Structure formats: C-alpha cells, structure tokens
Amino acid sequence: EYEVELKKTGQIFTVSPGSTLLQACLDNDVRIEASCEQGVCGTCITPVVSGDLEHHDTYLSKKERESGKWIMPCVSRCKSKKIVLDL
Amino acid sequence: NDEREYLRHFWHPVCTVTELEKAHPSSLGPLAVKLLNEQLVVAKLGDEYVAMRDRCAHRSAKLSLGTVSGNRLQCPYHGWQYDTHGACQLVPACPNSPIPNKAKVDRFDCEERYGLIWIRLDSSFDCTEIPYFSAANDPRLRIVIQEPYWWDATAERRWENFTDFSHFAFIHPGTLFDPNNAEPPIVPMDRFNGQFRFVYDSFSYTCSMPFAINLEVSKYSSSSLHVLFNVSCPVDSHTTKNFLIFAREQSDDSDYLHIAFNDLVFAEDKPVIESQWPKDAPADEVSVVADKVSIQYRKWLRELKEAHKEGSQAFRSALLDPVIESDRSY
Amino acid sequence: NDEREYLRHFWHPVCTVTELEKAHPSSLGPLAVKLLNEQLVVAKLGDEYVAMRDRCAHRSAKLSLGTVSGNRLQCPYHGWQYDTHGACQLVPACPNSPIPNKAKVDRFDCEERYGLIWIRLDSSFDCTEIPYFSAANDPRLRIVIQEPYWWDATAERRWENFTDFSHFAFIHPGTLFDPNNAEPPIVPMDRFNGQFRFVYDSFSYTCSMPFAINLEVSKYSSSSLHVLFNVSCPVDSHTTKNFLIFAREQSDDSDYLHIAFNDLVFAEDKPVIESQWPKDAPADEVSVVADKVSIQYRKWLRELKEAHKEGSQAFRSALLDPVIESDRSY
Ligand code: FES
Ligand code: FES
Ligand code: FES
Ligand SMILES: [Fe+3]
Ligand SMILES: [Fe+3]
C-alpha cells in the first residue's frame, strides 16, 4: 500500500496510498504530460526500467503491457515496492 | 512536403469507373486526377487502366487534354504517344529519328476494383493491398456506387468522423441518434492483416488502414444486412474526394431511398468536420474515454509514419503484425 | 507577425449587439468574429457577453456552429459545454467520468458598451480602457448605430483618413469641401488619458488610441450639436470591420437622412484608401507640414510599440503620461 521510485536523474519519492502515480510525480515536480486523466489518450506514457506493474489503461497493447517497459501513470500503479522510470 | 510521404505506399481511390468513362467522349479518358498533391492522368490503354503523371516529357503540356489513340495516350500539343509504361513510341515530327531515351513520363500502379480506380504511388515496399470491401462477390447483395463527395477536411479527420459514436446525439438527432442506446461503449480493437476490427451491439468494422472503412450492419441477423464502404482520397493537405459504396440484401426498395439518406447524414457532418482547425489534428486535443477508436487510430498512423522512416521491413511489420485485444480467434 | 503584438492590449470592437442577437435564432449567439487574425466566438451566457477562442478543446470544431444551452456554450460536434470561464462543465459521452483538467478553451475580457461588443486579447498590462464616446448618457441626443462597414484597408490607414484635413477638396469635393476654407490648419495636439485631443474652427476630436475617433461638432449651421464616433477593428493584416455611431441634438429628422450621407462620404473614401499600397505604410512615405495629425499618430504608435517590448509599466507610461501642446487644462 506504498511504493518508492527512482530515475536516470536519481530523484526518488513515495506515492502515498491516496495518490495516482501521476499526481505523486507532479507533486515532486516531474514534468509529465496529461490530458485524459483516465487511461485512454496516452500522452502520459512514460518508460519503465524496473518494477512489477498493474495496468488500468485502454491505450497500451496487451504485448506492451506485458513487457514492463511502459506505464500510464494517470491510472496505473506498481504492486512491487519500487519502480524505476527512465526519466 | 514529407510528413505525408508514408501515404504514398498505400492504394488510394482517385475516381469512379463511370467518372473515367464520362470524362472524354471516347469513354477511354483521359481524366485528370490529383492525389497527395500529385497531378496524374488516368486512361484506359487497351485492357489496362494506366496512370501517369499528367505532364508530358517534351514541352510539359497536360496529357489530360490529350486523347487515347489505340493503346497509347497522345499529348494534345505535338502529338507524342505514350505506352502503358509511360515510354514515348511516336514523335510525329521526326518519325524516322531515334526517340530520345528521356522521352518518358512516370507511371504508377493503377488497378480497378469495386467500381473505383486505385493508384499506388510508391510500390517499393511491395506490402500494401487495395482496401477490403466485404460485399463484393456476395450475390445476395445489391451494390450501389454513389457519386464521389468532396469535403474540405483531411482523410484522417473524415475517417475519424465515420467511426465516431459520441456525435450522433448532436449532429444526427433526426437520423442516427438512438435515444435508448444513447451513450457509446468502449470496444476491443484488433489489428489484423493491416485492418482495424471492432464490433457493437450489431455493427462490425473492418478498416483497412489508413482511410477505408467497411461497416457491416446486421439486424441481429434476423432481418437482413447492409454494408457501407467509405474511403477517402487524400487529394491535398486540406481536401478529400470521398467515395461511398453500399450494398444491401433487401434490394426490393429504391436505391434513391438509401442514397438520399446517406446524402442527408453526410450533409449533417460536412459543415462541422470542415470547421475543425487546424485541419490536421495537433497534439493539444483533449480526449476522454469515449475516444478510444480515435486515439488507437492515431497511435497506429504514427507507428506507420516512424516505421516508414526505418524502412521497408519495419513498415511491413507495423502494417501486418497482428495486435489482438478481443477474444475472437484468427 | 508579432509587430502587431502590442495591439492585443487594447479593447477592440468585434460586432454590434444586434449582429450578435441576429446571428442565431435564439438571439443568444454564438457569433464568430476575427480580431487581429484570431478566430473567436462571442455568446451571451447568463448575464455576460462571453468571448472564447472559436475552437473546441476536444476535437477542434468551431464553437460558433454550436448553440447556447443554459449559461454555457455547447459545441456542435459532441456537445461539450463551456461556462463563462471557458471550462468544460459537461462531457455528454462519459457523464459519470471526471472532466479532464485541460478540457478548457481560452477566454477573453469581453464587455458591452455603446451597443458594441469589445474584446481585450491580452489583459496582462491592465491599463487600457474601452474608447470614449462623448454622447453616451447625454439624454439630449439621439444615438444611431450604423451597420458595420468593411474596408480592404488597415485600421491605421482608416484612422488616418478620418482625421485627415487635406483630402476634402479632392475626394469629397461636393459633400465636405468648403471653398474658402481650402487649406488645412496645423493644430495643437495633446495627449491626455491615452487619447489624442485637438480642435479646429468647431470640430473637437477625442481619439482614444489606437483606433477610435470621437468628433463633436458644434455646427456653423445650427448652434446645436452632432457627434461622430468611429472605431476601426483590425481583423487581419489587410482588412477592417469599421463601426460608426452618431448622435445628434436636432433629433427631429429622419435617421436615414444622415445615414445616407455618412454612407456616401465613406463611398468616396473607400476606393482610394483601399488603393493605398503597401497596406501598412512604409518608411518612405514623404509627409508634409499639413500632415501633422498623421505624423503625431505614427509617432505615438511607434513609441507604444517600443514600450510594449520594455514591459508593462513602460507601456502604461507611453499610453497614459500626458503631453500638452495647446493651452487647455484637463
Ligand atoms: S493522461 Fe491520457 S492516458 Fe494517462
Ligand atoms: S508537349 Fe507533349 S508533344 Fe510537345
Ligand atoms: S469537438 Fe467539441 S465536443 Fe467533440
Ligand atoms: Fe457522421
Ligand atoms: Fe473622408
């Protein structure tokens, strides 16, 4: 019910249980685009290095979802404990 | 201008067969046409529908003001004749001199199907086919080919309107809006064999990418089925020549009962879709969950764009690799 | 490009009120308008005249094709509705989904006065006000609002024609020329409150910059007043939508007597001012002494254009700092 995360910029922070990964990111001053803040437009797509993922979007193909290389932070989350985004 | 270069690998419809036969009293053409800003001429040379650049290699006159002579297109100015490969075979002023090797105009893949004439400007990836029309061959079905209709909108925007669900209540209240089934669903979409496929409840789409839609409406199979086939010719950056062919089982009624109805719903869309600016969809449009089809459509066109830059094999994969989202089996 | 950027800080008239009421049968609008190459839509939402960019945030339809529903402007395509702040408050396709935060369109300062609708595209310098019309509120006078008249000419050149004293003998010989007043005076011109002020004998000009002109005339034919308020709207690089309101003390005669006269004066100007090329006056025009009004006005605009670059306060100073040449007080 809590997750940390890292970057290629080294920054690291925590998603309190009431937040979207996206809101966590913005709260910590990560520039990350958004529009359909439900999982469809796809502009918030961001890339993943590590971590185990749950998708709730309707943008990523089943194969894209099964590759841990992408995530839509507006609606998706991490069930692992850490997740590293390549940003 | 080369954001639209990938479009040259696809087959595009440029005219109806009856437009070519009407064009010139000979019934062989020539007919001038414009596709992705290219100026082309179409003509029947022998048993072939031939498509060349509408510009003669000699003094740059338009072959579309010429005439078909036997199996050749004859320029109207000094009478040069061009064969089905765009090579000059007769220079009337020096019939005994050699024909310069450059005496040649570009030729393009030109094939008829479904009653329309399709042109493929760039065949070098050898991996695109003419869009799919479900109702051809099926002999239970009467097939009508409406006159082409022209919109001041792009093939992408016209495409998206034809596959749109959210807009019935507002543009087509009198003609298409079903007030009990008022709100649109989200449906799984498959990529298969270069086509998008998705269904409703029953409407079944088979959208051969980029610009063709094949819509099979059945009345829960009880009554009888109706097929709409709509394809957009990207004439230039702002314009579409749009083709609608429709087939129906129930052939006992008047063709002009349907032609008027189609005509009506198109007249309802045209002024809205033409109003959209900028004409090409910029990156600041805000979507919501009902827009799944439009987003998925744009996702794939971008991939086809990038795949094209990478080259032939990349493009073949992008277009033909299956991407199944539903339970239907292939 | 952005050499006209400073003009966005002023209030400009886009339409008469009747034009908006006439535009759509509801009498609430919407009405499309072009101001400095910007495409906008104007509508009466509740008690407010609202101005938005004429471009939906969903898929970019023109909201001017839409309809006013409640206190919102409803898009023609999928019926998103926008409140007085340009925020979408209803997405008909997913009513049980939250509206995206980017689901909004740019809104502009929009205010009615004198029977016209005014828009201010840029409010950041917060120091401009709607031009001054001397005959509003004065209950002794009968005000008339002519229909907008369009000229293939810029707002700057329209203004210079209206305050010009040197053309009467040639363009308006039989309608405004005074034989034994054939040579124009040079006059004191003051800057007050962001306005040019000057008189001539009387004729008392109060020109709120950049494009408004308020001319009071205490007739040598009456001992009673007559007032001309003319304001050019720059719709694009080459054209203006021009407004004329006039008030008169002797209110007993037909409105059309004067309407026909004004319309005839403009008819005499129009061809000549349209012929002026380039549309924007270049540096190689050679002024003379009698062009004092032309010169001071180009000078003030040039200063204002510079001031805009150096930021908010330098602009507010160039507009509002007073400069007195005559012997009057204020
Ligand atoms: S913001 Fe559009 S899908 Fe996440
Ligand atoms: S231009 Fe074609 S023959 Fe001279
Ligand atoms: S484009 Fe305006 S609501 Fe869809
Ligand atoms: Fe439609
Ligand atoms: Fe004049």
Short mmCIF file of N, CA and C in Angstrom, two decimals, chain C residues 132-135 159 162-163 165 168 185 187-190 195-208 212-220 224-230 293 326 328 330:
data_model
loop_
_atom_site.label_atom_id
_atom_site.label_comp_id
_atom_site.label_asym_id
_atom_site.label_seq_id
_atom_site.Cartn_x
_atom_site.Cartn_y
_atom_site.Cartn_z
N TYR C 132 -13.58 56.28 -25.70
CA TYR C 132 -14.52 57.20 -25.08
C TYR C 132 -15.49 57.71 -26.12
N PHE C 133 -16.77 57.54 -25.85
CA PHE C 133 -17.83 58.05 -26.70
C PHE C 133 -18.51 59.18 -25.94
N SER C 134 -18.45 60.40 -26.49
CA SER C 134 -18.85 61.58 -25.72
C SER C 134 -20.36 61.66 -25.51
N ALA C 135 -21.15 61.04 -26.38
CA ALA C 135 -22.59 61.27 -26.42
C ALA C 135 -23.39 60.17 -25.73
N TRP C 159 -8.01 55.15 -39.77
CA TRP C 159 -7.94 56.24 -38.81
C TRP C 159 -7.34 57.48 -39.45
N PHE C 162 -9.71 59.45 -41.52
CA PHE C 162 -10.85 60.06 -40.84
C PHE C 162 -10.47 61.40 -40.22
N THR C 163 -9.27 61.48 -39.63
CA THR C 163 -8.72 62.70 -39.06
C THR C 163 -7.98 63.56 -40.09
N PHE C 165 -7.35 66.25 -42.87
CA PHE C 165 -7.95 67.51 -43.29
C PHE C 165 -7.66 67.86 -44.75
N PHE C 168 -10.35 66.81 -48.35
CA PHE C 168 -11.73 67.23 -48.57
C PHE C 168 -11.91 67.77 -49.98
N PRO C 185 -5.39 73.76 -41.51
CA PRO C 185 -4.55 74.34 -40.45
C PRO C 185 -3.65 73.30 -39.82
N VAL C 187 -2.43 72.20 -36.14
CA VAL C 187 -3.19 72.40 -34.90
C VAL C 187 -2.42 71.86 -33.71
N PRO C 188 -2.65 72.38 -32.52
CA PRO C 188 -2.07 71.76 -31.32
C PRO C 188 -2.73 70.42 -31.07
N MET C 189 -1.93 69.44 -30.69
CA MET C 189 -2.44 68.11 -30.39
C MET C 189 -1.88 67.68 -29.04
N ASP C 190 -2.77 67.40 -28.08
CA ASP C 190 -2.37 66.97 -26.75
C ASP C 190 -2.58 65.48 -26.61
N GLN C 195 -5.48 59.49 -24.87
CA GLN C 195 -6.24 59.98 -26.01
C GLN C 195 -5.50 61.13 -26.68
N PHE C 196 -5.66 61.25 -27.99
CA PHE C 196 -5.28 62.46 -28.70
C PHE C 196 -6.44 63.45 -28.65
N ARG C 197 -6.15 64.72 -28.38
CA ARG C 197 -7.17 65.76 -28.37
C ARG C 197 -6.73 66.95 -29.19
N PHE C 198 -7.62 67.44 -30.06
CA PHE C 198 -7.34 68.63 -30.86
C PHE C 198 -8.64 69.17 -31.44
N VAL C 199 -8.65 70.47 -31.76
CA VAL C 199 -9.84 71.14 -32.28
C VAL C 199 -9.46 71.93 -33.53
N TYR C 200 -10.48 72.53 -34.17
CA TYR C 200 -10.33 73.13 -35.50
C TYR C 200 -11.57 73.99 -35.76
N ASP C 201 -11.37 75.26 -36.13
CA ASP C 201 -12.50 76.14 -36.43
C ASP C 201 -12.35 76.93 -37.73
N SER C 202 -17.23 74.50 -34.65
CA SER C 202 -15.92 73.91 -34.40
C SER C 202 -15.94 72.38 -34.49
N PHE C 203 -14.75 71.78 -34.52
CA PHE C 203 -14.56 70.34 -34.67
C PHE C 203 -13.60 69.88 -33.58
N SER C 204 -14.10 69.10 -32.62
CA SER C 204 -13.32 68.72 -31.43
C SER C 204 -13.10 67.20 -31.40
N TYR C 205 -11.88 66.77 -31.75
CA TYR C 205 -11.52 65.35 -31.82
C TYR C 205 -11.02 64.81 -30.48
N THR C 206 -11.56 63.67 -30.06
CA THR C 206 -11.09 62.93 -28.89
C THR C 206 -10.87 61.48 -29.33
N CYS C 207 -9.62 61.14 -29.61
CA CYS C 207 -9.27 59.88 -30.26
C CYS C 207 -8.62 58.98 -29.23
N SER C 208 -9.39 58.06 -28.65
CA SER C 208 -8.76 57.06 -27.79
C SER C 208 -7.91 56.15 -28.67
N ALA C 212 -9.80 54.54 -32.21
CA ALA C 212 -11.09 55.19 -32.01
C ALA C 212 -11.00 56.69 -32.26
N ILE C 213 -12.10 57.28 -32.72
CA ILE C 213 -12.17 58.71 -33.01
C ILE C 213 -13.53 59.22 -32.55
N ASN C 214 -13.54 60.22 -31.68
CA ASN C 214 -14.76 60.82 -31.16
C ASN C 214 -14.76 62.29 -31.57
N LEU C 215 -15.63 62.66 -32.51
CA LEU C 215 -15.63 64.00 -33.09
C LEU C 215 -16.93 64.72 -32.77
N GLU C 216 -16.88 65.72 -31.91
CA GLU C 216 -18.02 66.59 -31.62
C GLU C 216 -18.02 67.79 -32.56
N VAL C 217 -19.20 68.16 -33.06
CA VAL C 217 -19.33 69.28 -33.99
C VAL C 217 -20.43 70.22 -33.51
N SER C 218 -20.04 71.42 -33.05
CA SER C 218 -20.97 72.49 -32.69
C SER C 218 -21.18 73.35 -33.94
N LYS C 219 -22.21 72.98 -34.72
CA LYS C 219 -22.35 73.37 -36.13
C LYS C 219 -22.29 74.88 -36.34
N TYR C 220 -21.71 75.28 -37.49
CA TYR C 220 -21.90 76.62 -38.07
C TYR C 220 -23.08 76.59 -39.04
N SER C 224 -26.35 73.90 -32.42
CA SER C 224 -26.69 72.61 -31.82
C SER C 224 -25.75 71.52 -32.34
N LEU C 225 -25.65 70.45 -31.57
CA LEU C 225 -24.53 69.52 -31.64
C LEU C 225 -24.81 68.34 -32.59
N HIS C 226 -23.72 67.64 -32.94
CA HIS C 226 -23.70 66.46 -33.80
C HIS C 226 -22.39 65.73 -33.53
N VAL C 227 -22.45 64.41 -33.35
CA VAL C 227 -21.31 63.67 -32.82
C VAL C 227 -21.06 62.42 -33.66
N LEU C 228 -19.80 62.20 -34.05
CA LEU C 228 -19.39 61.05 -34.83
C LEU C 228 -18.39 60.24 -34.03
N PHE C 229 -18.71 58.98 -33.78
CA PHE C 229 -17.83 58.06 -33.08
C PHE C 229 -17.53 56.92 -34.04
N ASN C 230 -16.27 56.81 -34.47
CA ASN C 230 -15.86 55.85 -35.48
C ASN C 230 -14.71 55.03 -34.92
N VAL C 293 -1.28 65.60 -38.07
CA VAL C 293 -2.02 64.58 -37.34
C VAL C 293 -1.51 63.19 -37.67
N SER C 326 -1.46 72.50 -26.50
CA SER C 326 -2.36 73.64 -26.54
C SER C 326 -2.40 74.29 -25.16
N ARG C 328 -5.08 74.23 -22.95
CA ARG C 328 -6.23 73.78 -22.17
C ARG C 328 -5.77 72.96 -20.96
N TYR C 330 -7.72 70.18 -18.55
CA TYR C 330 -7.98 68.75 -18.25
C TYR C 330 -7.89 68.34 -16.77
#
